[PDB]
């Protein structure tokens, strides 16, 4: 904990559900943002940490709280971005084992988000700190001393602090996107590479230059796009549109009406036509004539 491992995470497609899954990973609570929202949000320069926690002291070092471990091993501001992920390293630390000495006796409190690489023996008394730990002066690191006995009390926890740099730079780490699969010759909404739209999609015979990925017409609408999944190229045509017209002989001269669908193919229109689908649109049995 005294020299905790600051890490940088970049160019990452990272799913955080797996971390939530493990029963030892009982703690993934985040001071920063909701874990469910986290799986969707994108961040950059993600900071991950490596440290050994007894769990008896984690409350003291928990963000928003300060303890002698927090005052010396790792100071952390009350607001904490990202999550504190703690899982039991009860066995690996038990047997015993005392290597991971962590700073508990240092002269002054350290600044938040700071790692103290060098060990500073506590300058407590006026008498000089010569001879490392001694009278009026105490060694900072305490042997973490995890045994089978210390497996139960002060339970060993393998804990990582995840504090994402909140996409100050372009976000380089986040989770899965773009799940839906494509269909052709159907009026469907599309979000191809995040480009929202609605239309009927068909394979585009027109070529694309290798750098060119999306096609714009004279109207600047989208007419072709290279598929994000495959190099196959899709023409996008807007879904069928038209205005309706009603022919009537007059209300007094019967109530039968004739509906004309202007500028649309007769095969294209079912009775489902969607916009204005309230009308039954009569039926195919009713005489349907395709006119200019």
């Amino acid at each position: 904990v005294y020299a905790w491992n600051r890490k940088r995470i970049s160019n990452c497609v990272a799913d955080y559900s797996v971390l939530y899954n493990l029963a030892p990973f009982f703690t993934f609570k985040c001071y920063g943002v909701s874990p469910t929202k986290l799986n969707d949000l994108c961040f950059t320069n993600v900071y991950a940490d490596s440290f050994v926690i007894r769990g008896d002291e984690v409350r003291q070092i928990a963000p928003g709280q300060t303890g002698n471990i927090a005052d010396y091993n790792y100071k952390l501001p009350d607001d904490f971005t990202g999550c504190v992920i703690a899982w039991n390293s009860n066995k690996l630390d038990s047997k015993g084992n005392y290597n991971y000495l962590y700073r508990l006796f240092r002269k002054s409190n350290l600044k938040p988000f700071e790692r103290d690489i060098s060990t500073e023996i506590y300058q407590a008394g006026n008498k000089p700190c010569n001879g490392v730990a001694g009278f009026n002066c105490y060694f900072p690191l305490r042997s973490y001393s995890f045994r089978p006995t210390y497996g139960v009390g002060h339970q060993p926890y393998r804990v990582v602090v995840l504090s994402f740099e909140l996409l100050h730079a372009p976000a380089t780490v986040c989770g899965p996107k773009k799940s839906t699969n494509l269909v052709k010759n159907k009026c469907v909404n599309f979000n191809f590479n995040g480009l929202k739209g609605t239309g009927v999609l068909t394979e585009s015979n027109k070529k694309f230059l290798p750098f060119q990925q999306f096609g714009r017409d004279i109207a600047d609408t989208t007419d072709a796009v290279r598929d994000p999944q495959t190099l196959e190229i899709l023409d996008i045509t807007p879904c069928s549109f038209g205005g309706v017209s009603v022919i009537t002989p007059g209300t007094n001269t019967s109530n039968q009406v004739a509906v004309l669908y202007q500028g649309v193919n007769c095969t294209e229109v079912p009775v489902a036509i969607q916009l204005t689908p309230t009308w039954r649109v009569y039926s195919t049995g009713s005489n349907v004539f395709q006119t200019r």
Partner: antibody
Amino acid sequence: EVQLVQSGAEVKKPGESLKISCKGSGFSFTSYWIGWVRQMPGKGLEWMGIIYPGDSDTRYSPSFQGQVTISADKSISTAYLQWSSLKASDTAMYYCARGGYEDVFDIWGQGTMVTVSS
Amino acid sequence: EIVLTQSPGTLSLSPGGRATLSCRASQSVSSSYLAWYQQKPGQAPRLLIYGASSRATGIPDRFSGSGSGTDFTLTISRLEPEDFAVYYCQQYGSSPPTFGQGTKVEIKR
């Protein structure tokens, strides 16, 4: 208390799968790491790997990974080491010495002087 | 992993004298803190000393951990009947621990 009694020395016809038994007692299997070690007759012991006994997860020795099949049950507190199939070359002294990556001695088994011969 | 052999195979000597067990490591491993094993004669071995130079838990003051790197030289100030038995230098930090050649103490055939 933490004492480990292994299987007794047994005359064994070469070519059958036998689960040697190492009793565990007075310890939490997750809290106390168990290892596995065997001594062939008359020279230093050989590592069989270390088991995570709370999960009964034995990572066998690279020399003996797949060579022998090691199993143990935390609830029954008694190992069942299939040893793949016991062969005439497998004749050796087997010691149920608890230990992890630190490879400490902890408590050994009483000793398994299995002579795999007809 | 690291080959461990403690010179000699048998240090034939009178009891009560100071002796050292020079374990030879093919690769120098001070990070191993190797777990010295003292094989009880015809019994389940007891870890001689763990930590290479650190002493074993509950080991007598005569048994002193010493040696590091490619050569671990475990110093025993006074030989006893327990000392008159096979030893082993076994890797502690290093995985696939390797047992030593062994050492023994004796005076007469």
